[PDB]
Amino acid sequence: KFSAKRLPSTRLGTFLENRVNDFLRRQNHPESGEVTVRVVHASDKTVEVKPGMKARFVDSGEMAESFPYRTKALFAFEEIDGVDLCFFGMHVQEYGSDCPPPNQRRVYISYLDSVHFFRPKCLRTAVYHEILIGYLEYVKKLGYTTGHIWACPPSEGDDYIFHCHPPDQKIPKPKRLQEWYKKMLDKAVSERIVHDYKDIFKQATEDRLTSAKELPYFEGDFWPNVLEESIKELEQDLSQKLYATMEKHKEVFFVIRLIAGPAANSLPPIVDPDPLIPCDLMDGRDAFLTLARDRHLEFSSLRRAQWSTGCMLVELHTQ
Ligand SMILES: CNC(=O)Cn1cc(-c2ccc3c(c2)[C@H](F)C[C@]32NC(=O)N(CC(=O)N(Cc3ccc(F)cc3)[C@@H](C)C(F)(F)F)C2=O)cn1
Secondary structure, eight states: OOOSTTSOOOHHHHHHHHHHHHHHHHHTOTTOOOEEEEEEEEEEEEEEOOHHHIIIIITTTSSOSEEEEEEEEEEEEEEETTEEEEEEEEEEEEEOTTSOTTSTTEEEEEEEEEOSOOSSGGGHHHHHHHHHHHHHHHHHHHTOOEEEEEOOOOOTTOOSSSSSOOTTSOOOOHHHHHHHHHHHHHHHHHTTSOSEEEEHHHHHHHTTOOSGGGSOOOTTOHHHHHHHHHHHHHHOOHHHHHHHHHHHHGGGEEEEESSOTHHHHTOOOOOOSSOOBOOSTTSSSHHHHHHHHHHTOOOSSHHHHHHHHHHHHHHHHTO
């Protein structure tokens, strides 16, 4: 069988799928199936500071030229009608203890997606909370202090991970997206997994950030681009432009404090218990979108998403 269960295990993957399956066991719903969480890619990368910011702070020695991180691609599958369905995919960026500031001990949830066929429908949000909250708890135990989430609102026909979304899987508005993550984070705050969370604007204000070299620099994030455009415009201060852009989009950006204050200062180095997992199909989101486009693998209906997950799984086992 080329099932998701037969894909190599990881500490992270089995920690997450245990959290989901314990939850589903307690619910004891007849429509629910066994869930599989697999880390299908893990590789070391670096994000280079862009020219505008490089000239302003890197050439003057005020900021690092590049920040090293580990990128992981984790997928969740559920058994529906005897076959696996991939219903959740996430690409993360992890900036460890050997990363120069302002990026050290930070995790960035770059782009996230899902296919709304999780059965039963009533347990869908709860299962996503187990996955996201479970990931925050996991990295918090390894020594990561902060979590960052850009809830980038999608647009019709724009897929982040899964090619051809169901026509009725609706595109949430920024207000809806902010509300979902607020409810999710409020749940982690009450379970004592998260210390507290704030929007990016409230966060920069209460951290007393005065320079753009203090803002964490993430691969593909909105803020490395805002900074380039702000500098370019100012060539025709940077800090007031940054605070203005943060005020306008604060509802989409979350900063999540996992390890707060005193505990955060006496921390040992971050050591990942799992090995690196090469997989060029999951090296970023474009490889799997490209493959699904060329091979006509759609996730627009339940059976189409089940057939696509099957092809996806034989590609993952073949490497
Ligand atoms: C006319 N038809 C067409 O255009 C068909 N068509 C539809 C799309 C389309 C739809 C959805 C999405 C995308 C494209 C993007 F890839 C990303 C996205 N996928 C995804 O899961 N979200 C998060 C989301 O929706 N959450 C939050 C959430 C969910 C899971 C999770 F683990 C953490 C958070 C909800 C529960 C919310 F209600 F809270 F918002 C996306 O926004 C493209 N085409």
